[PDB]
Design a protein around this nucleic acid. Structure first.
Ligand SMILES: [Mn+2]
Ligand SMILES: [Mn+2]
Ligand SMILES: [Pt+2]
Ligand SMILES: [Pt+2]
Ligand SMILES: [Pt+2]
Ligand SMILES: [Pt+2]
Ligand SMILES: [Pt+2]
Ligand SMILES: [Pt+2]
Ligand SMILES: [Pt+2]
Ligand SMILES: [Pt+2]
Ligand SMILES: [Pt+2]
Ligand SMILES: [Pt+2]
Ligand SMILES: [Pt+2]
Ligand SMILES: [Pt+2]
Ligand SMILES: [Pt+2]
Ligand SMILES: [Pt+2]
Ligand SMILES: [Pt+2]
Ligand SMILES: [Pt+2]
Ligand SMILES: [Pt+2]
Ligand SMILES: [Pt+2]
Ligand SMILES: [Pt+2]
Ligand SMILES: [Pt+2]
Ligand SMILES: [Pt+2]
Ligand SMILES: [Pt+2]
Ligand SMILES: [Pt+2]
Ligand SMILES: [Pt+2]
Ligand SMILES: [Pt+2]
Ligand SMILES: [Pt+2]
Ligand SMILES: [Pt+2]
Ligand SMILES: [Pt+2]
Ligand SMILES: [Pt+2]
Ligand SMILES: [Pt+2]
Ligand SMILES: [Pt+2]
Ligand SMILES: [Pt+2]
Ligand SMILES: [Pt+2]
Ligand SMILES: [Pt+2]
Ligand SMILES: [Pt+2]
Ligand SMILES: [Pt+2]
Ligand SMILES: [Pt+2]
Ligand SMILES: [Pt+2]
Ligand SMILES: [Pt+2]
Ligand SMILES: [Pt+2]
Ligand SMILES: [Pt+2]
Ligand SMILES: [Pt+2]
Lengths: 94, 97, 105, 78, 103, 99, 83, 98
DNA sequence: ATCTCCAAATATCCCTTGCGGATCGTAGAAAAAGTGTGTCAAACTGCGCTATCAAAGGGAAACTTCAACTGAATTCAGTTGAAGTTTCCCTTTGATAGCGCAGTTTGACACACTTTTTCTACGATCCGCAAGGGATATTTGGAGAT
DNA sequence: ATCTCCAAATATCCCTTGCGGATCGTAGAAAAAGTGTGTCAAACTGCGCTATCAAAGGGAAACTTCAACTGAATTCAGTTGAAGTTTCCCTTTGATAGCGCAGTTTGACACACTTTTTCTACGATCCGCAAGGGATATTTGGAGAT
């Protein structure tokens, strides 16, 4: 049966950032843990936010304030800006 | 008549470990909360209970920290709490790197 | 442009992130921008760690990234270190560090 | 404002804490520590406020914020 | 009411609604609210049991926050359960370290 | 009337019933009532939270009394866990008796 | 066959090596039994939860994911074995 | 015959073990301990070999971190030598009980 | 100050594997496209409660006075843990084979959900009265002096 | 070890206010009923976990010797605490001014759902080859010794 993983996307991003560099299989496993880990923390807090505010839906707004709550200072700024910029670009299409 | 150094202290300890009253005066503390909030978002109000919440939480925190700081002092065969005690307390807690 | 990643300008997979938000019981409904914003954030953080681990592999004359490089990366960076303050990277070891008083005098 | 948290107040706190003798440098340190604490919680309390599109920090916004820092408080809407 | 069929004071119907609204899972079995209500009831029984006694020991007929704090901190297992909780207006257990006392 | 001042929902009256059951001559201040109301919500979430994860982990779509039980075993320390599993199993035995 | 006294498998050199990674220069003789106590209480707690996860799955084999979930529960998240 | 001063080998060992990442507890001993403990909770359990490896990674991590904190407690007390009361102090402040 | 020597670092060759870059063929999942439907954004509104104010007294915070006792430095001796040596246990490695059981598969259905009418528990609002607050006196448990 | 002397504890009475019962009215729980689909029981299976064995050898245990660290003992400048006088601001009380939170109504639109078309990503597999990593020899930085 199929085992889903972020390994391909992590390679892609690794090639952009360090184009002559490889990643060992354990190292990849950690990266895959990190991504599921962070996904969980963000979707979790976003979920609380919508409940706290009597709302049925998770929107990029909740993801945003979940990010502000979870990521430390400078990392929240850049991720907020990488995130809004991707949504803008995405709407600008279809 | 003089009480020896340490005796009124021990009396104070017994008194406060018996009461539940907040030990910080309400108004100075309220000004502090508003000063701080102001640095994050301007033009903000507070339900009275929210400041209350913040003062309960703040004091429980500090009281619990002096317990920890006090132990570190004793660990070093001392009886006086010093900054290095709070610093070690906070480090071992993982509050501080 | 077919895929929602391409549309958004992203390597991380908007389609997969959408599905996992839905099948994870976070809320009844999931907005259109949410998995986009979230895939963007996941991609940024992985790029910031891979960047920093990359440097670490190179400083240790190495071409391929291993868990010790991720560990050195995360703990030498004040902010990643905090984000993962309660995390254990299998096979990372610790930072070299010896308190002063223990050095020979 | 941080000097509103007066020396005698810090002493009372330290006494509930079980402290007999207090070095004179302790009163500044505690002020530093309380500021860092209050900042972190208020930062998050205000985050929750902004998100609700409100201008008033509520008791719940605080309770939520203390829950996030792993410091659940009972008695205000927990 | 499902509460009576189960012999409980705590509201089996509400606990059931609350489970469906909290997005915990797509579906909620019929047994699950009962067992949860039962556990909620057992634990609130267990606190008030010890808190009551603390009101006695302190010569009162009304339980106040400080009795909840004494109930809790004097009981090993609840102290654990509420390790990361502060009870507003509870204060602390009287404790003074040996070395601070006079000889 | 017409404009209704909303409606807060607590466990205050069930807590009062149980307090009677165990301390008939004892009562409870509104502050302490509020504390018990927090406790119940706090524990409800801690439990329902684990159950939810247990259901996900095991690729199932339902929170049954089996998940509540093991949630409870994970959440509560030694003796509390043992008692809580009694009172819960017993309530379900009894509820399914009644028809 | 009966399993007894296995915490003595955690040897004196092994505890010393861990102290070294931890920057410890001098170790008092009483440390080794304190360390066994601690490790034992640590493992009893994680394993207890791992095994609950296992019993829930109606399984007899304890998996990496039961351990990974147990550690997450204790607030000691582990990367490198799933999740 | 040559003889290093006490502390010299200790310092060099700290360097060696801080450079590297291998598990420091022996593998068969550790697995026997886990099985013993598992058994007191439930007879007839089996383990994926990687479940034991996860446990060992978590345990070596926990203890290495605890020794870091124990050392800070020894140094705080103007000693260089770790002792039982140092660990007890570290564990108390960390909020670990039992 | 200068030599001696030990363990970690560097240099050499060889070889195993785990990786990254293909090419593949193939299940499942993303997207495209259509349609049914409920969430929530706005706009208008009442009033709950936050902010503010003005004063006045009371007690708390600040500042001062003194010396008790504590923390920090110095010295030292017995204790104790580090370094190194020797002996041999037992862990590691590599392969084996038996099989216990994890995880996939497949039909039958109990069981949760969803919709709609009836029954009613629990929230809101009310306030008399006693549990507790506060004020004053009297007792008791200790501290500090001689 | 015995007398003087505070502050906390206990006793006691009179005032204040929030418990806790009672009234009333609705939002939600219960009953009844048609609906499908996740769960469960039961059959079949081969990954991989347990068990064993055998050989090699890396590392643990137990031991001697002694360097140096721990902690007991002593000294004392000085930093605190206790208590007195002085100065300042916090808490209470009584509203009045109005912000903005949250109640109500609604339809436009956005997201769910379900079917068909399109292609991404996972599992299975080979391959150039630099990356390692190991076994074997040598050189090297510096601790300790002469
Ligand atoms: Mn009773
Ligand atoms: Mn056993
Ligand atoms: Pt609330
Ligand atoms: Pt997994
Ligand atoms: Pt491979
Ligand atoms: Pt590969
Ligand atoms: Pt297909
Ligand atoms: Pt469409
Ligand atoms: Pt509609
Ligand atoms: Pt005055
Ligand atoms: Pt005055
Ligand atoms: Pt001293
Ligand atoms: Pt000596
Ligand atoms: Pt010894
Ligand atoms: Pt040795
Ligand atoms: Pt076989
Ligand atoms: Pt099965
Ligand atoms: Pt079927
Ligand atoms: Pt009374
Ligand atoms: Pt009274
Ligand atoms: Pt009284
Ligand atoms: Pt007396
Ligand atoms: Pt007396
Ligand atoms: Pt005396
Ligand atoms: Pt009231
Ligand atoms: Pt109605
Ligand atoms: Pt209704
Ligand atoms: Pt089906
Ligand atoms: Pt079916
Ligand atoms: Pt041999
Ligand atoms: Pt050998
Ligand atoms: Pt050897
Ligand atoms: Pt002196
Ligand atoms: Pt002096
Ligand atoms: Pt001074
Ligand atoms: Pt008005
Ligand atoms: Pt307005
Ligand atoms: Pt609004
Ligand atoms: Pt409508
Ligand atoms: Pt090479
Ligand atoms: Pt190499
Ligand atoms: Pt090499
Ligand atoms: Pt040299
Ligand atoms: Pt030298």
């Amino acid at each position: 049966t199929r085992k889903e993983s972020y390994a391909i996307y992590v390679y892609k991003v690794l090639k952009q950032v360090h184009p002559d560099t490889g990643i060992s299989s354990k190292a990849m496993s950690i990266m895959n843990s990190f991504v599921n880990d962070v996904f969980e923390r963000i979707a979790g807090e976003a979920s609380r936010l919508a409940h706290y505010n009597k709302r049925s839906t998770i929107t990029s707004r909740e993801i945003q304030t979940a990010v502000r709550l979870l990521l430390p200072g400078e990392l929240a700024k850049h991720a907020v800006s990488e995130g809004t910029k991707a949504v803008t670009k995405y709407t600008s299409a279809k | 008549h003089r009480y020896r150094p340490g005796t009124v202290a021990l009396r104070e300890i017994r008194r406060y470990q018996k009461s539940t009253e907040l030990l910080i005066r309400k108004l100075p503390f309220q000004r502090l909360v508003r000063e701080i909030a102001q640095d994050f978002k301007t033009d903000l109000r507070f339900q009275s209970s929210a400041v209350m919440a913040l003062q309960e939480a703040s004091e429980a925190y500090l009281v619990a920290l002096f317990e920890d700081t006090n132990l570190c002092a004793i660990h070093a065969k001392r009886v006086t709490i010093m900054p290095k005690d709070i610093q070690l307390a906070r480090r071992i807690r993982g509050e501080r790197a | 442009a077919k895929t929602r990643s391409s549309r958004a300008g992203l390597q991380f997979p908007v389609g997969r992130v959408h599905r996992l938000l839905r099948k994870g019981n976070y809320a009844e409904r999931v907005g259109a921008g949410a998995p986009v914003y979230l895939a963007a954030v996941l991609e940024y953080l992985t790029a910031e760690i891979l960047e920093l681990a990359g440097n670490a592999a190179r400083d240790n004359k190495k071409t391929r990234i291993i868990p010790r490089h991720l560990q050195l990366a995360v703990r030498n960076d004040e902010e990643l270190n905090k984000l993962l303050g309660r995390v254990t990277i299998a096979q990372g070891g610790v930072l070299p560090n010896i308190q002063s008083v223990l050095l020979p005098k | 404002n941080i000097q509103g948290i007066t020396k005698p107040a810090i002493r009372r706190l330290a006494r509930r804490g079980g402290v007999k003798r207090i070095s004179g440098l302790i009163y500044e340190e505690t002020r530093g520590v309380l500021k860092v604490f209050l900042e972190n919680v208020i930062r998050d309390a205000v985050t929750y406020t902004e998100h609700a599109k409100r201008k008033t920090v509520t008791a719940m916004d605080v309770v939520y914020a203390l829950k996030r820092q792993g410091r659940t408080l009972y008695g205000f809407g927990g």
